[PDB]
Design a protein around this ligand. Structure first.
Ligand SMILES: Cc1cc2nc3c(=O)[nH]c(=O)nc-3n(C[C@H](O)[C@H](O)[C@H](O)COP(=O)(O)OP(=O)(O)OC[C@H]3O[C@@H](n4cnc5c(N)ncnc54)[C@H](O)[C@@H]3O)c2cc1C
Ligand SMILES: Cc1cc2nc3c(=O)[nH]c(=O)nc-3n(C[C@H](O)[C@H](O)[C@H](O)COP(=O)(O)OP(=O)(O)OC[C@H]3O[C@@H](n4cnc5c(N)ncnc54)[C@H](O)[C@@H]3O)c2cc1C
Ligand SMILES: NC(=O)c1ccc[n+]([C@@H]2O[C@H](COP(=O)([O-])OP(=O)(O)OC[C@H]3O[C@@H](n4cnc5c(N)ncnc54)[C@H](OP(=O)(O)O)[C@@H]3O)[C@@H](O)[C@H]2O)c1
Ligand SMILES: NC(=O)c1ccc[n+]([C@@H]2O[C@H](COP(=O)([O-])OP(=O)(O)OC[C@H]3O[C@@H](n4cnc5c(N)ncnc54)[C@H](OP(=O)(O)O)[C@@H]3O)[C@@H](O)[C@H]2O)c1
Lengths: 459, 459
């Protein structure tokens, strides 16, 4: 049996731990799926490439608004898939060989579960391929997996998730997306812009409800005019309809479609580790960690979707950096360790219109009894918005009336994830709204003027 | 004769001075040209509207890069002009009516010259219409006017400037642009993207020479591959060739074209004021002002292109704010006045690729003997750049190695004017590169990641 100084489960954000500082130790890497994690292979990077390709098609279709009459002759979907994954798939091979060919690193490519903690304090790890080995330190970065509604599993219908929908052979004529989350909105924008009729079947009343209500309400109205939104509906049964699918709803209605996409959330992969049998506490389906990303077991850390409350890559990268530093520190030297910063976590939704948010919502600030001022600035009231002929883009700012510092920022419009970065900077470093608006220059007539005027209107 | 408490020459940024604090005084406004200033009518706002329409056409034309085959059927230039100026022209009329209809404000629509200072200390102003009136305070906001090379004036050829080129009836087949400045680059991007053959005739060796050399070298190479760039050339003569023009260059060659556009710089309108006869100092062709926007004449302020070293609207607006505040203070109470801030003045060039810069260039920092670190990060090394398939976009950052503070930032690529805003914020408030890179979150996989990775690389 083998012995290792450190073992890492998951090649997503956990792959960014083995520095040159571990060149003198032996490490074991576990990856049951494709090397590189979810975001690289079937996550952020592939999706945002399809989003950009869809936005090019959307620009062509609405070009007459600006005086240019054009039309799409063809959508070479096969070349779009080959272009995206022709770049991504080789990264998984070269990144995997980078670990195998290293003599200090061993790579196990099967599902790895925790075993009983050995008498000498080292952790036993066992794979589904039959291998068994020990490790002194262990890093848990198992990520998350998609969740499919139980009624859809019982029906046995052919369905797709975010893991498999991007490598489909041909673009369908009609798609039904079940879910109201970040994935559901992003893919609805991708397919509708590429010429697909999109049908949303959501159980709630708003799309992207975990965002500020001003954003969800306005975005759902816009989405309902270009996609068929069926609110307060759940899929209860279904059957095969040739290559397509027929889905029965909870009101007796039946929807015929060519493709089913499920985007009803993801769940951490902690419940498939037997970690509690090895001393790691698990609440809900997640691994409990403290501000140093330390678990309830000595020498065992966790990061990413398996433990963090935010299922975001920029958060998983920050947590991986904390684990990378705290692994070289003594387990009890907490004052020499680094603390994970979750104070101003932002997030973006790459839909049309684009959504980006950071901090508290208006209702979240009211629930905390904070005295706030709120301004909602329109894109169309800015010189750059005039060139866009924009009539729906808004920027929402919430400030604490006492200190005058930014409490939350919510942008729904063009370049939302880029426009919010100056607001992320002010919140993270404690810059007041008054200082941010006039204590610096804003390029005229650039787009960020909509953020400047949003700060100025905070009366 | 008439008497006024304050007189303002120019309805550009100077029009944004008379608030309700002057509602109890009598004011005289002078506007020899069209009401609203240059930026509203024939400047930033109209140009950037045509720029956005050009980006729509170029997106359609290069859509095959992403798998969508499309083509422009027609470019309705007539509808583009009517859409742009259909928004702008009524603003000039309603904004002018807003001032005339006010009983405390009178608007003079002819060129206003300075007269001899009256015995009572008040300034005399006379218009070409024969009217004469006096004013206690005077605000100078005469702006600038285009400069035409003397060889072009001597030829007597029909030419266009930025003031008149946007109202052309029909899109030309071939255009020759004389100049290598901000206006020349922006219109070359506008017309070439709409299908016009663009020929640049510049006397220097780089386009946008007053920018960082890394930007000038790379942008000129890119621009020379899609526009016909003739470097080290001047127009010496010309004559009419039907509706078009033929221009002889300083090397004997002759260029035939359908439209001539001159963009060889602007000069302040101070030399048309007779200001020295009334006590206002004039060096070069600019009005001399201090850090309080005060001229050499008591009670006379100045702002905008007539005095500022920066011919930018966001700078002219900041100087107009200083004049607005310092007018209500005593002329000798300099300690109660506000100082004009010209630290870290940014600027953008709305070309393809887009250019935005703030602070010092690498060579300017070397001339000051500063110990600097420089990093040039490529758009293509970021997940968002992968979706764009970008192969030329760069962001260049210069920091002082001692303090770790940003000295200059130069971006050439997509959304350059939007990505530069966080860098403008860090420079304006004294945030170090290390703090900005890791003391805040960056949304994955958004575009500002190219700025984050640029900050990390300043080894
Ligand atoms: C479609 C989609 C789009 C997204 N877009 C964004 C976005 O724009 N921005 C953003 O910030 N986030 C986005 N995310 C979220 C992002 O994927 C995660 O936040 C992030 O990748 C978490 O990284 P991780 O390493 O913890 O998870 P993963 O990358 O999933 O790492 C876990 C890996 O380890 C493997 N593994 C799990 N358990 C075991 C085991 N027991 N043994 C061996 N191997 C195991 C898994 O198969 C997987 O390969 C998106 C997610 C999806 C699904
Ligand atoms: C094509 C173009 C594009 C530009 N793009 C940008 C850009 O993207 N960003 C940016 O920041 N800046 C830009 N600028 C510069 C911007 O227009 C000016 O810096 C800004 O308008 C300065 O304002 P001002 O009031 O001083 O000048 P103006 O707005 O020109 O004000 C002067 C006005 O007073 C009138 N006047 C002058 N003399 C007299 C007199 N004796 N009597 C009566 N009236 C008089 C003039 O006719 C004019 O109407 C651009 C300029 C041009 C020409
Ligand atoms: N760009 C990005 O930052 C990005 C992109 C993609 C994903 N993500 C992240 O990835 C994670 C998962 O994304 P996701 O879109 O799958 O989930 P999500 O964002 O958490 O939203 C999932 C949604 O599924 C709906 N749902 C659940 N069960 C359902 C059922 N049985 N029937 C109908 N609807 C049901 C819920 O609607 P109700 O709430 O009304 O019940 C819920 O809001 C999240 O952390 C998300 O933020 C981020
Ligand atoms: N978005 C913006 O911020 C924006 C947009 C438009 C305009 N502006 C500003 O508004 C003004 C517009 O000026 P502009 O764009 O017309 O010009 P400019 O950018 O000021 O410079 C034009 C250039 O033309 C060259 N030139 C000068 N005289 C010439 C001659 N006789 N023959 C041939 N070439 C000659 C020079 O190149 P060399 O310097 O290499 O000799 C000169 O610098 C500037 O202040 C500009 O910065 C700003």
């Amino acid at each position: 049996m083998e012995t290792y100084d450190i073992a890492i489960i998951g090649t997503g954000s956990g792959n960014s731990i083995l520095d040159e500082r571990y060149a003198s130790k032996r490490a074991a890497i576990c990856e049951q799926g494709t090397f590189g994690g979810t975001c690289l292979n079937v996550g952020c990077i592939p999706t945002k490439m399809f989003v950009y390709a869809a936005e090019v098609a959307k620009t062509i279709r609405g070009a007459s608004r600006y005086g240019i009459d054009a039309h799409i002759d063809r959508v070479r979907w096969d070349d779009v898939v080959s272009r995206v994954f022709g770049r991504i798939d080789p990264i998984a091979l070269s990144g995997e060989d980078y670990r195998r060919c290293a003599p200090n690193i061993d790579v196990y490519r099967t599902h790895t579960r925790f075993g009983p903690v050995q008498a000498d304090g080292r952790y036993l790890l066992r794979t589904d391929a039959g291998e068994e080995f020990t490790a002194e330190q262990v890093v848990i970065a198992a990520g998350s997996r998609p969740v499919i509604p139980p009624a859809i599993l019982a029906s046995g219908v052919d369905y797709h998730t975010s893991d498999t929908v991007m490598r489909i052979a041909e673009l369908p004529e009609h798609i039904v997306i079940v879910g109201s989350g970040f994935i559901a909105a992003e893919f609805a924008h991708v397919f509708s812009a590429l010429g697909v009729r999109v049908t949303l079947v959501i159980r709630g009343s708003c799309l992207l409800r975990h965002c500020d209500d001003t954003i969800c309400e306005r975005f759902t109205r816009i989405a309902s005019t270009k996609w068929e939104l069926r609110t307060h509906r759940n899929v209860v049964d279904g059957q095969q309809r040739g290559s397509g699918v027929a889905l029965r709803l909870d009101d007796g209605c039946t929807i015929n479609a060519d493709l089913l996409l499920v985007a009803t959330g993801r769940v951490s992969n902690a419940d498939l580790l037997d970690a509690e049998q090895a001393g790691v506490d698990v609440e809900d389906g997640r691994v409990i960690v403290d501000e140093y990303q330390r678990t309830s077991a000595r020498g065992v850390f966790a990061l990413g979707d398996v433990s963090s409350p935010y299922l975001l890559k920029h958060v998983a990268n920050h947590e991986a950096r904390v684990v990378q530093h705290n692994l070289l520190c003594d387990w009890e030297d907490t004052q020499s360790m680094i603390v994970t910063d979750h104070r101003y976590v932002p997030a973006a939704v790459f839909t049309d219109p684009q959504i980006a948010a950071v901090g508290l919502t208006e209702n979240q600030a009211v629930a905390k009894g904070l005295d706030i001022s709120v301004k909602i600035q329109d894109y169309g009231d800015v010189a750059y918005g005039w060139a866009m002929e924009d009539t729906s883009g808004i920027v929402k700012l919430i400030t604490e009336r006492g200190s005058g510092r930014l409490l939350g920022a919510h942008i729904m419009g063009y370049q939302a994830s880029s426009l919010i970065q100056p607001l992320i900077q002010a919140m993270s470093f404690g810059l007041t709204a008054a200082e941010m608006a006039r204590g610096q220059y804003w390029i005229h007539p650039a787009l960020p003027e909509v953020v400047e005027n949003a700060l100025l209107g905070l009366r």
